[PDB]
Design a protein around this nucleic acid. Sequence first.
DNA 1: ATTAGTTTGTATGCAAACCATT
DNA 2: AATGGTTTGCATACAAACTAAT
Lengths: 139, 147
Amino acid sequence: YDCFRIAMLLKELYSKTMYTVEENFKENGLTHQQIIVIKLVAHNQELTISQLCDEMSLAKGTVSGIISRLEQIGYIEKFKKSNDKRNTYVKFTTTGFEFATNFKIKMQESFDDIFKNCDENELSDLVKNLRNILAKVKE
Amino acid sequence: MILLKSNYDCFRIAMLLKELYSKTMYTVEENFKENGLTHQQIIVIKLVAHNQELTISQLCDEMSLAKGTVSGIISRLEQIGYIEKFKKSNDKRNTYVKFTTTGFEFATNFKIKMQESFDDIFKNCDENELSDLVKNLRNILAKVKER
DNA sequence: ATTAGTTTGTATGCAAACCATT
DNA sequence: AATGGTTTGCATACAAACTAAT
Ligand SMILES: [K+]
């Protein structure tokens, strides 16, 4: 099995989902990654940069960059906890909350309308494989 | 009072895709960090080696990237000297890439290492599971490529 | 010593804008 | 004019190397 053809095959699906998300949110000045972050905070309230990394399958140095550039935009806020002043935490600002709320539906539909012509079975059958192989790959 | 139409979580599908994608390509970068080549430069080389010559538009289709992105990757990879850009007299807009001698020697020595760098990620993964992966990828990909 | 983060350097991710060719 | 490509101006990809803080 030519796992190159397999890689490029993901490359294709992956590319198409994320840059669709870019298009849908081009009007609001957000990258697909920004949108990924906002979707992730709006679910978890606060997150360590470290958890973001895990969640977005992304290195610390990149998440670092992204969250800062979001801070400057005034959507997220970083903070440090009294007990342990190393861990940096991320949560919404007022506008952050207001955005997530106003666009909750659009963010939800960007990803969802990508696969509309698929059936739920066809979707979950993919998720099963993904989770399966993903596990096989990890050791 | 809102009635938010709940559905199926395609955000989950993106993040998993992302994870499987990420681990695959950045594994390849480490595999070729000694060699001074990014995984993108390697994908190019694997394509040029298989197809002999390719136009920038053909590369976009193969790597699923945008003309400007790929224009960059080639120009930089020409600076290292593994890749010649040329134009055919019959339509001079089109720009093709193919190997230099140096880049052809590379592609020859390191074929096996490029082949096993991808295949070793799915070493622990056996045949059914891959066929399934392809099956589902190809199918869902067909449905997204409608609108 | 150690771990969480941030910075730095270089290659990219894109659309839009710009250019050569048809 | 209309493409195929290239440039540009950003936000990012990582890993190393630096910086707090435990
Ligand atoms: K990038």
